[PDB]
Each structure stands twice: as C-alpha cells, then as structure tokens.
C-alpha cells in the first residue's frame, strides 16, 4: 500500500498530516499549516558543524575532574549520545511512511538530519576528552541504567513501525498469518502514532533538558566550555524539535486535521499523562545514579529533581495535560542564559 510516488493527482492542502495519500510531488509554494515550513527555514538557518568548535582544552578539564564529577559528566554524555542515535534514524523510519503533506515530510527529514549532526558532535567530544573512545561507546549499549531508558523510548517507535508494516501490506480488517489471527485497525494505528508522538515530545522536551542542566552546570564553573558551546547549539535545535511535536500533537487533539484523532486524544488523556509522569520518574531516578558518589558546585539531586518537576509541568501544560507536581519554580534560573 506504500508507494514512493503516488500517481493519483490530489490536493495536498486537503490531505490530513497523516494516513492520507502518500506525498508524491514535493512543492513548497503552498502549505496546509505553515508552521512546518517555518521550522524547516529556521532549522536550515541554524546549520552548524561540530568540527568548527574547539574542544581541545576540555580534555584538560576532564582529566582534572574528580572521579564523581567525571561520572556525572560522562554518564550524561553517554545518555545524550544514545537518545540522538535513536532520534537520528527514528523520525525517518517511523513517521515518513505515514506522512501525507509535503511540508511535514520535509520537516521530518530535516529534523532527523539535524539529529545526525548532534550524534557527530558527541563523537567529536568523546574523541577529544577520552583516551579510548571505544570504552565510552561500548558502555552505552551495556550500561543497565541507560538501557532501562533506551527500551521504552524505542518501544513506542518499534510498535508503530510493526503495525505500519501490517497495515501497508494486509490493509485494514482481520487476517490470518501462519494460522494466527491479526487485526489491523486504523484507529489502533492512529493511537500508536499519538502515543509515540507523546513519547518523542517527552524525550526532546524533558529528557534532553535535564542533560542540558548537567552540561551547563560545568560551564558555570568555567569547565568544559568547548562542550558547552556545542550543547548551546544542540539546545537551540532541540527547541525547534519540541515545537514541531507540540504543534503536531495540538493540531491532532483539536481535531482541526483529522476528527478521529481528536477522539483518540481524549481516549488517551490518562495513558498520555502516565507516560509523561513515568518519564519524569525515570529522570529523577537518573539523578540518583548521577549523584550517587557525591554532588558538585551548582547542582545536586534536590536541585535536579526539582528542575525535573518544574520542566515536566511546563511541558505537559503545552500539550493540554494535567500538571502532576506542586513545583512552581525553576531552581536553576541561570540555565536561561544558556538556552536559545
């Protein structure tokens, strides 16, 4: 059911963002929702190359950091490296086969692409501060702590990809495959997609902002400033990334795109609220892992866990969900001089 060039001439302005007729002609003269065209323009104007930033002195700072501070820094770096590895390929394999409007298709591709630049910058850093980069890279797949957060995020993607395959192959309805029943509902598929987008929004809007806190905490003490210059640029991109998923989620919930989606939005309010809250809990448990051997100047478990709450509330707010925490303020206001 999927074609790289649908032969039916259609009005792209009348197609839903998802599940419509695959995009055939790529035009940017007109747009259904010009937010995506703006995101593309913005992202392109922000184009940067990691190689350009000098992270040579960071090598010295890193070597001088006491054990626990190295731990804090490196664990954080490994996590980011993993999240962007997933973010690099995923928007492409998972969303591309379902997009129905040119603007969104190109945005997804541009978004996925900037993530690869992020992954490259992580190599650029790791390469210049560690002696054997392989040590670091290997632990990213090994480390049970990181692994617990890896699956869960990849699960929402994997399920979507599998269901999408079936739907494209067998079409809707009940089917038989090697003597088993298989039910392909377009409603279930749309639900999986929504959930996945909630998860991705949590990933970029919450998880990544927690790591930015750690990186900037060091920069505040004038340490790891090469790394800081890079996180500064990555954070600038991340803002665009989360804005994209916010608008997607909000267009879908308001039913201004596909009304079956607006229904799905409400039938999931709880499941969505739960995944967001679960994410925040994981991040708080991550803070434990990070500070197990001791804190550092400007940051500790309490400050970080409160930040997780503050940030989570603000994000859930933006996609019309209930705030799950009492926290009303940001404990590290200095992070704003680094952001955007």
Residue closest to 50 by CA, chosen among 108, 127, 137: 127
Among 56, 165, 281, 317, contact with its own copies (rule: CB under 8 A):
165
- Catalytic entry in 2, 28, 33, 122: 122
Instruction: Restricting to residues 127-146, name those near its own copies by CB under 8 A.
Output: 127, 133-134, 137-138, 140-142
Is residue 106 within 8 Å of residue 31, measured between CB atoms?
no
The answer to the question of residue 334 lying near its own copies (CB under 8 A) is no
Q: How far apart are CA 77 and CA 327, in angstroms?
A: 27
Q: How far apart are CA 116 and CA 216, in angstroms?
A: 22
Output the smallest distance, CB 42 to its own copies, in A. Answer: 12
Q: How far apart are CA 166 and CA 163, in angstroms?
A: 5
Is 84 known as a binding-site position? yes
The answer to the question of residue 85 lying near its own copies (CB under 8 A) is yes
Q: How far apart are CA 43 and CA 32, in angstroms?
A: 19
Q: How far apart are CA 69 and CA 24, in angstroms?
A: 51
Residue closest to 194 by CA, chosen among 261, 137, 136, 139: 261
Residue closest to 77 by CA, chosen among 264, 226, 293, 272: 226
Q: Of the two residues 123 and 330, which places its CB atom closer to its own copies in the complex?
A: 123
Output the smallest distance, CB 156 to its own copies, in A. Answer: 9
List phi, psi (to 5°) of 82. Answer: -70, -50
3-class DSSP state of 19: coil
Among 119, 211, 246, 327, contact with its own copies (rule: CB under 8 A):
119
Q: Of the two residues 9 and 328, which places its CB atom closer to its own copies in the complex?
A: 9
Is 241 known as a binding-site position? yes
Interface region with its own copies, contact rule CB under 8 A, candidates 92-100, 201-209, 269-277, 319-327: 92-100
Can you read off the two tokens belonging to residue 112? 């996925």
Residues 6+ apart with CB under 8 A from 147: 141
Instruction: Restricting to residues 1-30, name those near its own copies by CB under 8 A.
Output: 2-5, 7-9, 23-30
Residues contacting its own copies: total by CB under 8 A: 71
The answer to the question of residue 268 lying near its own copies (CB under 8 A) is no
The answer to the question of residue 204 lying near its own copies (CB under 8 A) is no
The answer to the question of residue 188 lying near its own copies (CB under 8 A) is no
Q: Of the two residues 7 and 329, which places its CB atom closer to its own copies in the complex?
A: 7
Q: Is 122 assigned a catalytic role?
A: yes
Q: Of the two residues 158 and 285, which places its CB atom closer to its own copies in the complex?
A: 158
Neighbouring-strand partners of residue 99: 18
Among 46, 113, 273, 289, contact with its own copies (rule: CB under 8 A):
113
Residues marked as binding? 84, 115, 118, 204, 238, 241
Catalytic residue IDs: 122
């Amino acid at each position: 059911a999927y074609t790289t060039f649908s032969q039916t001439k259609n009005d792209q302005l009348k197609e839903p963002m998802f599940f419509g007729q695959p995009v055939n002609v790529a035009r940017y003269d007109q747009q259904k929702y010009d937010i995506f065209e703006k995101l593309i323009e913005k992202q392109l104007s922000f184009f940067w190359r990691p190689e350009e930033v000098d992270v040579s002195r960071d090598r010295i700072d890193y070597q001088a950091l006491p054990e626990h501070e190295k731990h804090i820094f490196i664990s954080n770096l490994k996590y980011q490296t993993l999240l962007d590895s997933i973010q690099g390929r995923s928007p492409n394999v998972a969303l591309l086969p379902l997009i129905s409007i040119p603007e969104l298709e190109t945005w997804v591709e541009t978004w996925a692409f900037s993530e690869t630049i992020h992954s490259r910058s992580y190599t650029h850093i790791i390469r210049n501060i560690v002696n054997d980069p392989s040590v670091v890279f290997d632990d990213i797949v090994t480390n049970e702590q990181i692994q617990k957060r890896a699956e869960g995020i990849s699960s929402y993607y994997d399920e979507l990809i599998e269901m999408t395959s079936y739907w494209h192959l067998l079409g809707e309805g009940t089917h038989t495959v090697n003597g088993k029943t298989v039910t392909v509902s377009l409603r279930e598929l749309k639900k999986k997609l929504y959930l996945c987008l909630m998860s991705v929004n949590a990933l970029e809007a919450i998880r990544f902002y927690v790591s930015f806190a750690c990186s900037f905490a060091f920069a505040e003490r004038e340490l790891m400033e090469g790394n800081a210059k890079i996180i500064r640029l990555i954070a600038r991109d991340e803002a665009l990334h989360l804005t994209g998923t916010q608008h997607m989620l909000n267009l879908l919930r308001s039913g201004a795109d596909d009304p079956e989606m607006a229904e799905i939005a409400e039938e999931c309010k709880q499941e969505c609220y739960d995944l967001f809250v679960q994410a925040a809990q994981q991040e708080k448990d991550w803070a434990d892992y990070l500070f197990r051997d001791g804190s550092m100047i400007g940051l500790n478990k309490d400050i970080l866990c409160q930040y997780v709450e503050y940030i989570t509330n603000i994000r859930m707010q933006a996609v019309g969900l209930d705030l799950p925490f009492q926290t009303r303020s940001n404990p590290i206001p200095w992070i704003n001089t680094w952001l955007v």
